Amino acid sequence: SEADRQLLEAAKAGDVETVKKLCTVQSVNCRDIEGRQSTPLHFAAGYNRVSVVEYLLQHGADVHAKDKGGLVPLHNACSYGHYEVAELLVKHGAVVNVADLWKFTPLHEAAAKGKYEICKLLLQHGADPTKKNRDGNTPLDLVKDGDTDIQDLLR
Amino acid sequence: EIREQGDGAEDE
Numbered sequence A: 001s002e003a004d005r006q007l008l009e010a011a012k013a014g015d016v017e018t019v020k021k022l023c024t025v026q027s028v029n030c031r032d033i034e035g036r037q038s039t040p041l042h043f044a045a046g047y048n049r050v051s052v053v054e055y056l057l058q059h060g061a062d063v064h065a066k067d068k069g070g071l072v073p074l075h076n077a078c079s080y081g082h083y084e085v086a087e088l089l090v091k092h093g094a095v096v097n098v099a100d101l102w103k104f105t106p107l108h109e110a111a112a113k114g115k116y117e118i119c120k121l122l123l124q125h126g127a128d129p130t131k132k133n134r135d136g137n138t139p140l141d142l143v144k145d146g147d148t149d150i151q152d153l154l155r
Numbered sequence B: 001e002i003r004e005q006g007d008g009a010e011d012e
Helices: A002-013 A016-022 A041-048 A050-057 A073-079 A083-091 A106-113 A116-126 A148-153
Strands: none
Touching: A002 A016, A002 A041, A016 A050, A041 A050, A041 A073, A041 A083, A050 A083, A073 A083, A073 A106, A073 A116, A083 A116, A083 A148, A106 A116, A116 A148
């Protein structure tokens, strides 16, 4: 659908006014069929569009939606290091220990990317730093050797 | 296949 394509794009662009105009029952959780099946909320989260994330969360977006690889919008926020988005998604019920297809959790992502505040957020909401992904790696295992502050945080 | 991070962009 043409409105769907424009909504997904407005979410990436952070054009909240266009998002407001294009949001319908069906479009608010539509999927990018030719891409990774991301929803508007995956894109807003991944592109750090805080106002769009806030609007979507208030108007019918599913915080738990998975893309083709099993990523929820919290994974996108953590992977690209967007703290405010990660906090909003967690405050709105994102499951902090959710695993994608590869068994990576948001904390695996935040640890690998070395995002202090995001790791702190997830740990405070019960993120399990003992969880192994399919490489047998815990989030602590994914912290870069150069990233001393994150290592210490996760012990 | 390589594991993909999902749709999004880095902050500056």
